[PDB]
Amino acid sequence: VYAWNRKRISNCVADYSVLYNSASFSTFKCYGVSPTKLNDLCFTNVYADSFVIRGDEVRQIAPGQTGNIADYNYKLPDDFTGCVIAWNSNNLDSKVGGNYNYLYRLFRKSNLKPFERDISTEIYQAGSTPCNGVKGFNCYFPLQSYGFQPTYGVGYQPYRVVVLSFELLHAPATVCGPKKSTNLVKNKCVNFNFNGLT
Amino acid sequence: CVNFTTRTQLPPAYTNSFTRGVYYPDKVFRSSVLHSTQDLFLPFFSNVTWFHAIHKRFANPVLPFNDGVYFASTEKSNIIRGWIFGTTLDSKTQSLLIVNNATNVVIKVCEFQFCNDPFLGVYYSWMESEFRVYSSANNCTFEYVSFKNLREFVFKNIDGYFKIYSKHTPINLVRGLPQGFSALEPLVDLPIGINITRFQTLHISYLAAAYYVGYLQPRTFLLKYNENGTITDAVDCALDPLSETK
Amino acid sequence: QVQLQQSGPGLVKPSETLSLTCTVSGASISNYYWSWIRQPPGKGLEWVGYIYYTGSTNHNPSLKSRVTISLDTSKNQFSLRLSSVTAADTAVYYCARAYCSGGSCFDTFDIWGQGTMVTVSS
Amino acid sequence: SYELTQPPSVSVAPGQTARITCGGNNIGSKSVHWFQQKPGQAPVLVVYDDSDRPSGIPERFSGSNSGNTASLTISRVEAGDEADYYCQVWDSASDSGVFGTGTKLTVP
Ligand SMILES: *[C@@H]1O[C@H](CO)[C@@H](O)[C@H](O)[C@H]1NC(C)=O
Ligand SMILES: *[C@@H]1O[C@H](CO)[C@@H](O)[C@H](O)[C@H]1NC(C)=O
Ligand SMILES: *[C@@H]1O[C@H](CO)[C@@H](O)[C@H](O)[C@H]1NC(C)=O
Ligand SMILES: *[C@@H]1O[C@H](CO)[C@@H](O)[C@H](O)[C@H]1NC(C)=O
């Protein structure tokens, strides 16, 4: 989560029906857009951010939310326009001995700005004495490992989270949703629509 | 990038456009009819600047784009390979790069850090193995990979769309821009959504071709679509009073 | 709820090595400073030393030459060894956890063990 | 060695305010903490960071640290407040915890 990945999506089409009609998502919440209306909207660009957090932290991924993840790992803007999707990944991101490859920023002197990624691993100086890269009192590692295990509770089990931020700026509309066509009938008075020409 | 100690460039040459540069205004078919439209055209009998591409390092010049550029090349082998478009042509701003390597055609919009002397080399069947055009390419915003010959192209950046129209004809003239009528068919429109004010030519180096550059203007034209829809003749509504009557 | 349990010899002969063990239950022994405090009869609390999960250890200057603090994360325990124990070492020994709020471990102790009485008598 | 001095005992009737003082050179520049220890029980943190109370500590307890003196104030002393109160600071020079001599609070 402290190193949440991001991908740009532009100049393409996607059928969001497979998305919001899929039951494989534990959390599916859209702000500023109707989940069932995605195929009906075009956007200049989209950002797909991806990471893993435990269930109890899933609620922090939303505008106006605070907490360790919201403040130090991943922050959303209050005017965020887009959707948040999350689903348990216990079978994938948990291990018998504890999956410690997932970490979250536990120390930070300030909160992250919207869509800010902080990957600094510098020893956090909690006192006046500098740490000089040596752990000790007032000197703690800024990241904390989840150590996910299959026996952890739902709120502690891992969840893969994807945030889709749709941006409809003054640039030409590039990302859209493919509308299914209909069979063609000849020699009958009908209403036609060919690639938008009606 | 490959560095050249001696950088030079041939002086520009000047000629006249005659009556080329016509390209289909829309994607609409008409049959045996005259249609009038006001768009960016290459005005008939315009001043055109032409130069040579040698395949001492003679480097192509960077030229302004203005509102639309008519490019042309007359060569036997495909010496001309592509172009670069933008305003600063550096890493500070997004830059467009179009090329047609031996494999296919590549078009990328990125914050390229272009080389001082863009280089594309071939060695002898001729096989290309040297491509040193840009030192960097970051924050990429677009990517898409697909007896003389006269290859003509028209580039127009309007409404965030870089529109390219093209034509390819077998030309027998040995020197000079050939006089004749041949419409440019649409090649492709790309919604890159960038600003372009200058450009430079991209050539191949064999380990000399000739090209022409003219500039479009907002002009009103009358095209004559044949029965088959081919653009047969055109009239510029501001060349001379006879044109205005037509 | 984190719990600390102290075990060791209730009676140790003079000049022998006193070995006390503190077991942590309900939470991982990691990411916390674990300290030993001794209360001699009739005297106030005296800090003996602390150990961090990374192996960093510090001790009271008056007891540095005789005190060793070790950590066993596999058993979630930490041990205090006092060499050449004397009658002055007869005391109640508690293990305590440094208070860590917001990730910063303060110089206070929030969780204490019930304490174990060690008597040095021949 | 850095030392903290506390009164040996403080007697305050129920309902009154008990003030326990902890003396030490430059203690004002250090974070002073107050622990409560009942007979036969382990010390319990009552105040930290010179004003802060761990969750569950009644509001009647309060801490202050000024100059060379720290003060623990117990408003409305109750029969349950009878215990030994210890002030603890951290000497960064020796990086060690220094505890006060302890004050026996009694409630007649
Ligand atoms: C074209 O422009 C050049 C200077 O840029 C000028 O010398 C030349 O006369 C022009 N062409 C004609 C036909 O006038
Ligand atoms: C990348 O280029 C785009 C151009 O559309 C610009 O808006 C964006 O700020 C650039 N990002 C960086 C990090 O330079
Ligand atoms: C392109 O130019 C227009 C007008 O000068 C300006 O509004 C726009 O911001 C420019 N775009 C870039 C990417 O510089
Ligand atoms: C149209 O094309 C056909 C064959 O493609 C040709 O026979 C015919 O002559 C053309 N029409 C005109 C008007 O040239």
Author numbering:
A (entry chain A): 347 to 544
B (entry chain B): 15 to 69, 77 to 145, 151 to 172, 186 to 246, 259 to 297
C (entry chain H): 1 to 122
D (entry chain L): 1 to 108
Recite the paper's sentences:
Alpha-B.1.1.7, Beta-B.1.351, Gamma-P.1, and Delta-B.1.617.2 variants of SARS-CoV-2 express multiple mutations in the spike protein (S). The RBD mutations found in Alpha (N501Y), Beta (K417N, E484K, and N501Y), Gamma (K417T, E484K, and N501Y), and Delta (L452R and T478K) are located in or closely adjacent to the ACE2-interacting surface where they have the potential to modulate ACE2 interaction or disrupt the binding of neutralizing mAbs.
MAb Beta-26 requires the Beta E484K mutation for potent neutralization but is also exquisitely sensitive to the L452R/T478K mutations found in Delta. To investigate this, we determined the cryo-EM Beta S/Beta-26 Fab structure. Since the experimental structure was insufficiently resolved to build the Fab structure directly, we constructed a model with Alphafold-2 (Jumper et al., 2021), and adjusted it to fit the density (STAR Methods). In addition, there are strong interactions between L3 and 478. These interactions explain the observed serological results.
